[PDB]
C-alpha cells in the first residue's frame, strides 16, 4: 500500500543473503536475524520497519570477510 512493501521484500533478501553466508551455524545470531526479519514483516509504520532494518543490515556489515561493498560497486559501475 506504500513503500512499506519494498522494505519487507528487501528484508527477506537480506536474511537469504545471510543464510547463504552460512550464518545459521550460530544459533545465537541466526535467531536474532530471524526475529528481526519477523519484526520487519509485522511492522505497522515505516519508522519501525527501517530501524529494525538498520539492526539487520548491521549484522551483514559487521562481517568483514562476507562482503566488500567496493567490489559490488565496481561490478555495477562497469555495467551501469
Amino acid at each position: 500500500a506504500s513503500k512499506m512493501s519494498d522494505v519487507k521484500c528487501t528484508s527477506v533478501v537480506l536474511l537469504s543473503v545471510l543464510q547463504q553466508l552460512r550464518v545459521e551455524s550460530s544459533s545465537k545470531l541466526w535467531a536474532q536475524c530471524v526475529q528481526l526479519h519477523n519484526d520487519i514483516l509485522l511492522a505497522k509504520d515505516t519508522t519501525e520497519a527501517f530501524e529494525k532494518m538498520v539492526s539487520l543490515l548491521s549484522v551483514l556489515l559487521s562481517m568483514q570477510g562476507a562482503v566488500d561493498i567496493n567490489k559490488l560497486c565496481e561490478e555495477m559501475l562497469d555495467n551501469r
Binding site: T10, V17, Q20, K52, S58, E75
Partner: protein
Amino acid sequence: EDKRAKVTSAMQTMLFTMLRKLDNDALNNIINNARDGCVPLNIIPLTTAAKLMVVIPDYNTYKNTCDGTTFTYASALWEIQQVVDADSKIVQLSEISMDNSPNLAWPLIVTALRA
C-alpha cells in the same frame, strides 16, 4: 562453488540495488561508512543506553562523525564511553587532535551508548 558463487554475487548485487532504491538516511549512512572502512562490530541497538561498537579507520572520518562526546551514526546520537586503539589501550578524548593524529595506532574503536 563456481555455480553457487555466481548466484551469491547476483543476489548481493540485487540486495544493495534495492537498498539504493530505498534512499533511507539511516541506511545510506551505515553503508557509506562501511565503504570507507567505518564498520560496526555488533548489531546496531535500538534501545536507549545500549552498547554499540564502531571502527573508525582514519582521522578524517573521526571528525565527520564525532563532536565532543557525541557520536553521530545511523541517523542517531551516541554518547561515547570508551576509545581504544589497535593495542586495546584506552585513549582519552583529549588525545584525538589534529596535531596528535599520526601518533595514535589507527584504527580506533568507540564504545558508545544510544541516547
